[PDB]
């Protein structure tokens, strides 16, 4: 899925 | 018992063309995703091993090839194996999909 995020 | 999908099962899934079609489960396969914390503070838990330029240890520094063709530095968190299903459609095309892209029949 190659997704990034700042959680 | 808990319901399960097995090889030979007649099911409904999404073709690469995006539409749904009846298809047959050819085999169960395990896909492994990697999780990393990027130096920039973000994180991804759905990279493939092929995106790192066995698995590294938690905290190990690694270089990740992102979707932009650029390389970013990160520290490895953990690997996530996920049960997936290889299905084949009428035209012979095949695809590896997750549980959520599969709709089972009563018989």
From Swiss-Prot, chain B:
Intracellular or extracellular location(s): Nucleus
Site (Histone H3K4me3 binding): 51, 66, 72
Segments forming a coiled coil: none
Organism domain of life: Eukaryota
Tissue specificity as recorded in UniProt: Ubiquitous.
Resulting phenotype, residue 66 to H: Abolishes binding to H3K4me3
Complexes and interactors: Interacts with histone deacetylase proteins HDAC1, HDAC2 and HDAC3. Interacts with RB and NCOR1. Interacts with VRK1. Interacts with FBXO22; this interaction promotes KDM4A ubiquitination.
Comment block on domains: The 2 Tudor domains recognize and bind methylated histone H3 'Lys-4' residue (H3K4me). Double Tudor domain has an interdigitated structure and the unusual fold is required for its ability to bind methylated histone tails. Trimethylated H3 'Lys-4' (H3K4me3) is bound in a cage of 3 aromatic residues, 2 of which are from the Tudor domain 2, while the binding specificity is determined by side-chain interactions involving residues from the Tudor domain 1. The Tudor domains are also able to bind trimethylated histone H3 'Lys-9' (H3K9me3), di- and trimethylated H4 'Lys-20' (H4K20me2 and H4K20me3).
Name of the protein this chain belongs to: Lysine-specific demethylase 4A
Gene: KDM4A
Residues of the full protein shown: 895 to 1008 of 1064
